Amino acid sequence: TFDMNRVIDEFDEMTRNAHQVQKQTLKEILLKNQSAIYLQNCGLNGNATDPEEAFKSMVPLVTDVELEPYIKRMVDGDTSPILTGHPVPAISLSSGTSQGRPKFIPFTDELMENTLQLFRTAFAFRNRDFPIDDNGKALQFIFSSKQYISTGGVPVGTATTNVYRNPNFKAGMKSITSPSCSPDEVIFSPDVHQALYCHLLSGILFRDQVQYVFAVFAHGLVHAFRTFEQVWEEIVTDIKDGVLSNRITVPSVRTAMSKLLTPNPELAETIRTKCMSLSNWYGLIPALFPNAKYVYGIMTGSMEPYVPKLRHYAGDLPLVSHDYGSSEGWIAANVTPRLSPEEATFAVIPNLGYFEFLPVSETGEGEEKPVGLTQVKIGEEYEVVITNYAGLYRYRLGDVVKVIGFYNNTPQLKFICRRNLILSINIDKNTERDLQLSVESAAKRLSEEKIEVIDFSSYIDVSTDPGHYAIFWEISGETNEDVLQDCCNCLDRAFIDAGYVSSRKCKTIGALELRVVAKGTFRKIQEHFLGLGSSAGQFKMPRCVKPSNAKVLQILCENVVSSYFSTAF
Amino acid sequence: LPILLDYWPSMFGMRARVALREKGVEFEYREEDFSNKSPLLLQSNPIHKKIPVLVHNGKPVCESLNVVQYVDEAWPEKNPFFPSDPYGRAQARFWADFVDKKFTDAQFKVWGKKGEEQEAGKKEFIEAVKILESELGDKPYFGGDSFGYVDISLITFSSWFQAYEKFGNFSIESESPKLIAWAKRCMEKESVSKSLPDSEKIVAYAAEYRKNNL
Amino acid sequence: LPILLDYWPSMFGMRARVALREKGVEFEYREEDFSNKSPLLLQSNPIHKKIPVLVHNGKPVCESLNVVQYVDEAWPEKNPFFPSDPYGRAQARFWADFVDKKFTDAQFKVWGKKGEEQEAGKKEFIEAVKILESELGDKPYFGGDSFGYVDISLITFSSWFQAYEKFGNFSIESESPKLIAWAKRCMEKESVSKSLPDSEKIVAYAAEYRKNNL
Ligand SMILES: Nc1ncnc2c1ncn2[C@@H]1O[C@H](COP(=O)(O)OP(=O)(O)OP(=O)(O)O)[C@@H](O)[C@H]1O
Ligand SMILES: N[C@@H](CCC(=O)N[C@@H](CS)C(=O)NCC(=O)O)C(=O)O
Ligand SMILES: N[C@@H](CCC(=O)N[C@@H](CS)C(=O)NCC(=O)O)C(=O)O
Ligand SMILES: CC/C=C\C[C@H]1C(=O)CC[C@@H]1CC(=O)O
Ligand code: MET
Hints:
The PDB classes it as ligase/transferase. Keywords: Jasmonate-amido synthetase, Glutathione S-transferase, Ligase-Transferase complex. The assembly is trimeric. The entry is titled "Crystal Structure of FIN219-FIP1 complex with JA, MET and ATP". Chain A is Jasmonic acid-amido synthetase JAR1. The complex is a heterotrimer, with 1 copy of chain A (569 residues) and 2 copies of chain B (214 residues). By secondary structure, chain A is of the alpha/beta class. Chain A is 36% helix and 17% strand. Chain A has 3 domains: 1-131 and 322-416, no CATH class; 132-321, no CATH class; 429-569, no CATH class. Chain A has 21 helices and 18 strands. In chain A, the strands form 4 sheets. Chain A has a 7-stranded antiparallel beta sheet. Chain A has a 5-stranded mixed beta sheet with strand order 17-14-15-16-18, with helices on both faces. Chain A is globular, with a radius of gyration of 24 Å. By secondary structure, chain B is of the alpha+beta class. Chain B has 2 domains: 1-84, Glutaredoxin, CATH 3.40.30.10; 85-214, Glutathione S-transferase Yfyf (Class Pi), Chain A, domain 2. Chain B contains 11 helices and 4 strands, in the order βαβαββααααααααα. Chain B has helices at residues 11-23, 39-44, 64-74, 86-112, 116-136, 149-155, 161-168, 172-175, 177-188, 190-195, 199-212, and strands at 3-6, 28-31, 53-56, 59-61. In chain B, strands 2-1-3-4 form a 4-stranded mixed beta sheet. In chain B, strand 1 (3-6), helix 1 (11-23) and strand 2 (28-31) form a beta-alpha-beta unit. Chains in contact: A-B, B-C.
């Protein structure tokens, strides 16, 4: 039951109660997960009078690689419990690479309760600084239309998709946020790139009522407001004629869009007029809806260079930094939304998990043991280690964060991060060069439509015999099937190495399948990543996924705008 | 060698079987027929006549959970089913007790009753199973850093997980992936592998219970 | 201090009450209007909503037999109810399991139900008081040479003996004299002496439940 004042107070109290809820959380995680095999070798039984000391002393810091082979076991046929505990409802992935190899993490139900508590507070506090209509809606470029399964018949999954797919969230979203313009089906539309300009449609529809434009980052807004560039008829011409534009080829989104289409000629006059009358599209967003109190998302560190554009799009409209945290971990939420992107700072949430930070102080690295989150000195930057119900215990994330100050008894952290990573020899390659070359050489074919590809990826499926490769393609614009079929061929044709060739010619591994995905999906993979509990930087994305990456996977299956196998061979 | 008098379809008997196989202590299995029960079962259990009874040192222990609790402490040298702390074991007995009444009551209605009892048993079972899931949250084994006291106790119902699916019309995987697949982990262990009878035989037995019992 | 949620006439509450004081702990008792289950109780046991509940280290312990186990394991230095051998533990846990199944329902039938159900119950409890007397044999106390775990479990039912006698219009002692005999002998221990409410009160609570549900 959402309410402004009582939620503040509850969170006011627990942030001030930081030490008790931090120590109780670790204990309540250990209570729930006292039987972890990882824990077993370490030698924990729970309870005791030194549990936290035992936790630090009897358990070692851990990297992605030795935890990979573990959580691999969960997904590949053996649906068994591992680092965390019971069989996971689905599996995470991380930016960067685990030994040049795909990353792995599990999620649980409690962090869904965490979803509901955390938006309530962030949204409550923002709404105190920027109150909102109860009967208004919200233009949010947010999408979760795609769901995949592991070889074991177990969904492996992303933040976006799972949260929205989970049963409690539409019921739990009603009173803390503005009802989405976009049907869930167009959010759940098999074609995002098509649905995305339709999402634009959607958010603009009730513009006087909408309280904000929202993306997790400026780039999406930018993308979208650079898609404000990149769409605007279709909508007008297709909303005009009461018939959706023929660019849209999908029945589900076609039926939904169709039920709301009748022929209106006066409005074109209006929508049109405003739009070519102004300078630079300075203030895109206030122009769309004057009424929006603020612009929302994460504008700090690496999205900082994308802020000018947003600002250019945003005009005088205030830019609000969004909270920080994710499927692996949630740490900080903004209870001071008014604060600018440049002065943006973030407040660690206390009951989400147990967090230890490794100091970088000496030169590089310097040898120092982990200290309490409250013990972290103000002004100094520590590497982030995160313990939580996602199943990582004393796991180092590889990111540097800065302590700006303290909200009562709780610490604040800020992000100037770039990429918290080092590379290792990859296993999904077919060098990135090749894969980047692969995408580049085949993309030229879609370039005759003069449309350029924003991002890409690849997959190996060892469930099927022969195992078959999967490429994921993210381009700004729609096109026919023949050309994507051709592109799939070139991807095979673009990987220049000898060994690729001997086997797909021998077909022990299936014809590389190019599954064209819709625009903004890999952007979505920036969306949960910079947002990812750690320190801002999380921006290197592994280009091809073995059965060792799973967040990207959930994304991959259901929004196959086009799904095809090479006609050659 | 300890002798265990066991009913192959009885779930409690499997738990004693799992216990002795988990430890690595050899035993002789004895199949009891309710029709002509052995002199020992009647001699060991004069009133209650209930499997599985274990006789160790010429001293017969009764109840399966008891077999388990007795079994843990009478050989505590290699495998600890329970945590060292008294309170961790507080959840132990409580959770054994949980699964033993409510869970056993729900499921027995599912494979052993018809009409509203099925329906009541369904929602009850699904809720029970949910409660385990939600309370346990993210735990590989119930009872401690290795295999646990209530893992064993709950793992016996894994054999009956598919008879419960088929009779109840509900997938225990679909609403609660974790518990059904917590059952698949334990299957890899030789304890659950060799102390847990095949799915097909017990479902016929439960199905036979339907034909046999009106 | 060890926090108790108790019901004035809950025999199981008594089992907690009898156990704690037996071993040597100063504790608090809270009386419960079950109409309004306590905020700490619902937090202790949301789904069961039942007592006795002993709270230690800000942690809730539940179920009567469980609570007496918590009692032993939390300060195992002065008064152990259990024998040293695992098997005597098993017998004692077995005998604790006996009192709860047919023994509890039987008395529940004798003062809780009438007629067709009543006489069924009265034959049930006299059967169990017979089994009980024979297993006692010569012993000063079931559980061990001295005060035992399971002594604590069924000693609390002895205050309901008046209730069983009056509505039951039967004398349990003449058919089985030594159980009831032993129970007033157990009364001498200070734990059971202070923990147990008056029998006329219990009789009248039983009457209160009878008069209402006719
Ligand atoms: N503290 C938290 N830890 C983990 N997830 C959280 C936390 N708070 C909220 N969530 C939510 O988890 C939900 C789902 O993300 P999710 O965990 O399902 O995908 P996942 O498989 O764990 O991992 P990933 O997104 O990296 O692939 C989101 O809606 C997210 O907001
Ligand atoms: N209390 C014992 C006995 C349990 C019990 O009643 N088991 C059933 C097997 S399903 C049984 O023995 N039934 C005997 C019968 O059907 O007569 C235990 O928990 O194992
Ligand atoms: N196994 C439990 C059973 C407890 C029980 O039957 N409790 C009754 C008291 S007679 C109860 O709490 N009923 C709940 C209520 O009255 O609302 C225990 O031994 O503690
Ligand atoms: C449940 C909390 C709501 C706020 C979180 C989600 C958003 O609404 C935007 C991203 C954020 C997740 C992230 O930071 O990755
Ligand atoms: C708004 S719900 C969660 C959004 C998050 N940034 C994601 O992309 O997963």
